[PDB]
């Protein structure tokens, strides 16, 4: 009961063009492809979000490196 129609918009406006230091990330949650574009935001050991295109090489590569974030 409440903001039930307000789904979690885990989508970002743009993805990071700079290549993250793969190791620096600890996990990656999938951004819904229903938003502007399919993406995966990475959670660093600092809890910082980094939105990336799941269709981008360096993005899928990290996703195959770090596990999926449960949050």
Q: How far apart are CA 26 and CA 71, in angstroms?
A: 12
CA distance linking residue 14 with residue 16, whole number of Å:
7
- The helix/strand/coil state of 49 is strand
Which of 7, 4, 16 lies closest to 42 in space, CA to CA? Answer: 16
Obtained via which technique? NMR
Of 28, 35, 69, the residue nearest 52 (C-alpha)? 28
For 3-30, letters b (16+ CB in 10 Å) and e give eeeeeeebbbeebbeeebeeeebebbbe
Distance, in Å, from the CA atom of 45 to the CA atom of 16, rounded to the nearest integer, reads: 17
Which domains does the chain show, CATH number per domain? 1-71 (2.40.50.40)
């Amino acid at each position: 009961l409440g903001a039930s129609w307000h789904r979690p918009d885990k989508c970002c406006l743009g993805y990071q063009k700079r290549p993250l230091p793969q190791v620096l990330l600890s996990s990656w949650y999938p951004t819904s492809q229903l938003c502007s574009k399919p993406g995966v935001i990475f959670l660093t050991k600092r809890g910082r979000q980094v939105c990336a295109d799941k269709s981008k090489d360096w993005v899928k590569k990290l996703m195959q490196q770090l596990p999926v974030t449960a949050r």
